[PDB]
Amino acid sequence: VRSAAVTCLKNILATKTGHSFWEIYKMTTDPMLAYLQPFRTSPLSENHDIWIKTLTCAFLDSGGTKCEILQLLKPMCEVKTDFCQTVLPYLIHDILLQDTNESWRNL
């Protein structure tokens, strides 16, 4: 129901690739909210890393010393870009959570 925020919902189709959507068939039976997810979406995807310790002074400024606590999205983006690619869903959701809601970014 948000305005100008439905563009990030398209990233769910890329994040629902066959690399982690193996449990979708098991979750679509018991739950009921999967009816709208399967109609919107349904190969795999991967990425790489560059640095590991590139968040020395940027990790201690999640909430920000000054006002405008919305800068936490920059810390999440920095902790998601230069990190391990083990969490394929969290790595694919980095482009969506960049301009998404603050609650979703914190979660």
Binding site: V1, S3, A4, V6, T7, L9, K10, L13, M32, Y35, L36, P38, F39, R40, T41
Partner: protein, 332 residues
């Protein structure tokens, strides 16, 4: 020359000369391979010309359809036609402080004393000097400032083009390209187009607000025209889009007729709690709006008469008890 005062989308508009090589010569300055990326508007214009020629000067001008035979990229037309479907043009109570509470502060200049400064010929030597100054270039700030003090439903009061009869041309040409081809991707292109039609909300006061609502109503009518095809393609996404449109319209009006027509639930009688928010938003602004909106909001009472599959409705209609205030007593 207006580019300097105010450039990639101009190629699709300049390619209309072939309907020739001037557009390709102008595009060759930067990249001659970007013709496929900006081909969406060209294909939309070609489809519009074919629709105008199938059923006038357009029928004779559409004879240049052979220019599009350079490639055979037919799969790229899935996400296209968005601009063709969105185009429908080229086809108040702040004086309640009557008591002394407003006497301490200033008062509203609504009497004849507000216009008591007609005799101003003494300062004419300074008025004329300021008129010839750069103030004439900013004088529009005073004329573009009186567009306030009005929160009424102006949308409830507002023949745009002829795209309804020319909408099934591509479907009849490409074997139901709007319904069968759109259902191959599980209505993904349809959802993307529905999102892009609403993302273009920039000036809904008196500009694009009069055309975006009409485009949304036309898209809803085209999606609801199919009984089995739309229920086989997608229903939850359509319900979510309708609920989002209703929630966006309730934030302000005449578009409630489209929601009422989509809420008939002829083949969609398998609804769920996803309509509770819409039923609450329709009843919230029911008695607060005008008589026209109060009469058009009879969709809630029409849906309340459903005797089958209405267990969840009877369980979550606890919020409908507010209709007894301005009774609307029969619904309560």
């Amino acid at each position: 020359v207006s580019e300097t005062f105010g450039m990639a989308s101009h190629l699709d508009y300049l390619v209309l000369e072939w309907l020739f090589i001037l557009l390709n010569y102008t595009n060759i300055e930067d990249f001659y391979r970007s013709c496929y990326k900006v081909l969406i508007p060209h294909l939309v214009i070609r489809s519009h010309f074919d629709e105008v020629k199938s059923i006038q000067e357009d029928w004779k001008s559409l004879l240049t359809d052979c220019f599009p035979k350079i490639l055979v990229n037919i799969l790229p037309y899935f996400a296209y036609e968005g601009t063709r479907d969105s185009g429908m043009a080229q086809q108040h109570l702040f004086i309640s402080n009557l008591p002394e509470i407003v006497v301490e502060l200033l008062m509203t200049l609504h009497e004849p004393a507000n216009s008591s400064a007609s005799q101003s010929t003494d300062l004419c030597d300074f008025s004329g000097d300021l008129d010839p100054a750069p103030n004439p270039p900013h004088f529009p700030s005073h004329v573009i400032k009186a567009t306030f003090a009005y929160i009424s439903n102006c949308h409830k009061t507002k023949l745009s083009k002829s795209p309804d009869s020319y909408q099934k041309i591509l479907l009849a040409i490409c074997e139901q390209a709007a319904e069968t081809n759109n259902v191959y991707k599980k209505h993904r292109i349809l959802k993307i187009y529905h999102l892009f039609v609403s993302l273009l909300l920039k000036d809904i006061k008196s500009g694009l607000g009069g055309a975006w609502a009409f485009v949304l109503r036309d898209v809803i009518y085209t999606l609801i025209h199919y009984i089995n095809q739309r229920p086989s393609c997608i229903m939850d996404v359509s319900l979510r889009s309708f609920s989002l449109c209703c929630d966006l319209l309730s934030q302000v009006a005449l578009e409630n007729h489209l929601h009422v027509i989509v809420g008939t639930l002829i083949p969609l009688v398998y609804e769920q709690v996803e309509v509770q928010k819409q039923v609450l938003d329709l009843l919230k602004y029911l008695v607060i709006d005008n008589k026209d909106n109060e009469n058009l909001y009879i969709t809630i009472k029409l849906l309340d008469p459903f005797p089958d599959h209405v267990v969840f409705k009877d369980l979550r209609i606890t919020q409908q008890k507010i209709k007894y205030s301005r009774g609307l007593e029969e619904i309560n």
